Design a protein around this ligand. Structure first.
Ligand SMILES: COc1cc(Cc2nc3ccccc3c3nc(N)nn23)cc(OC)c1
Ligand SMILES: COc1cc(Cc2nc3ccccc3c3nc(N)nn23)cc(OC)c1
Lengths: 207, 207
């Protein structure tokens, strides 16, 4: 298990998301579904010139899985997935400029719900989750687990759980007061409101 | 010069865009700027693992160029650009499913401004343009010119104009009654309203 420090700017963003009083927390779901849709778009596009890229699974979809026993909400996609280099370096590099723009927009009167316009919507997970675990598998790379409870550090290890084929599972370990996002009614409401035209099937699992 | 038929579903979409009474035409600009931003995101991401991909130009930006003598508004980006296969086959293949979803959403009460949510925002160009010409250059491929005035066909040829390095120029040959989109005031207004947080510099050229 390897431990890494977030760049100062990302740690600062995560602290803002965790500390700022902001009641409209439900937007985390739209941001993660959007991220899944983007990853699904990428593998779909790649498959048009190299069909063998779908040997790891032809189905392009999103699953939403609540688990009350674990207090987790999991967003699963069969998108392109992420490499070790994405997890350690690439995503953070891209996120630096978006974070700067977002935090400047916030000082100028924008609000947290606009986070996705800056390409850093992933971190909105911290509105509802005390810990986020990400399991991901890219073609021609190993299955990895990324994890962070904020506090300035994240970990990456090779994952030895159930093999996933290709894609990403974002596991939200929900804060004690955020268990409404395990309720079928509440998830259905939020998907209808903010994610109604996503171009891939979204299946909400039942407990 | 090669001439191709649009798929029936795309021709149908273009006819809907051209024929439907819909006053909120200004949204074409947001859709094309969004497309440029996406292409810029792609080359930026690629460059992180292969720096030589920016040998064709390091600057990542968007230019908006009006020309009253030609009655054109040109949207230029230094994004990843498009291949011959993109222009002839790939983009149309992806667009088929999005078109179906969009046209179904329209029958259910959605409006034309939501076109971007279905990944077919490019065709919104036909709200204001009688002809659209696209000049594009991808790394390791030739510079191409795509062109269509709708009517069910488009053309692709190798471009012999000024070499562009890398990226895409979308040239909108404006309809006679749509010359307001050449006015500096009007473009500035529209960019401020719909494209205010794009993560790349947008330069509006003056005539
Ligand atoms: C900036 O930090 C991030 C951002 C993301 C969003 C993100 N980025 C990607 C980049 C390339 C290929 C696939 C994906 C991707 N798939 C999914 N589901 N999210 N996601 C995911 C993430 O997981 C640890 C960290
Ligand atoms: C569906 O039909 C389309 C769609 C587009 C949008 C589009 N698609 C891309 C795909 C891959 C790489 C770059 C781009 C791209 N750059 C830009 N500016 N638009 N654009 C552009 C287009 O130009 C002829 C036709």
């Amino acid at each position: 298990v390897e431990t890494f420090a977030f760049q100062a700017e990302i740690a600062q963003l995560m602290s803002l998301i965790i500390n700022t009083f902001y009641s409209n927390k439900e937007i985390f779901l739209r941001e993660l579904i959007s991220n899944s849709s983007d990853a699904l778009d990428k593998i779909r596009y790649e498959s048009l010139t190299d069909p063998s890229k779908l040997d790891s699974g032809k189905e392009l979809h999103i699953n939403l899985i609540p688990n009350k026993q674990d207090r987790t909400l999991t967003i699963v996609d069969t998108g392109i997935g992420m490499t070790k280099a994405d997890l350690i370096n690439n995503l953070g590099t891209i996120a630096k400029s978006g974070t700067k723009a977002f935090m400047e927009a916030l000082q100028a009167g924008a609000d947290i719900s606009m986070i996705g316009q800056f390409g850093v919507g992933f971190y909105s997970a911290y509105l509802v989750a005390e810990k986020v675990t990400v399991i991901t598998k890219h073609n021609d790379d190993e299955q990895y687990a990324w994890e962070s409870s904020a506090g300035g550090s994240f970990t990456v290890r090779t994952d030895t759980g159930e093999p996933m084929g290709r894609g990403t599972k974002v596991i939200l370990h929900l804060k004690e007061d955020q268990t409404e996002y395990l309720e079928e009614r509440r998830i259905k409401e939020i998907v209808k409101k903010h994610s109604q035209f996503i171009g891939y099937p979204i299946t909400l699992f039942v407990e």
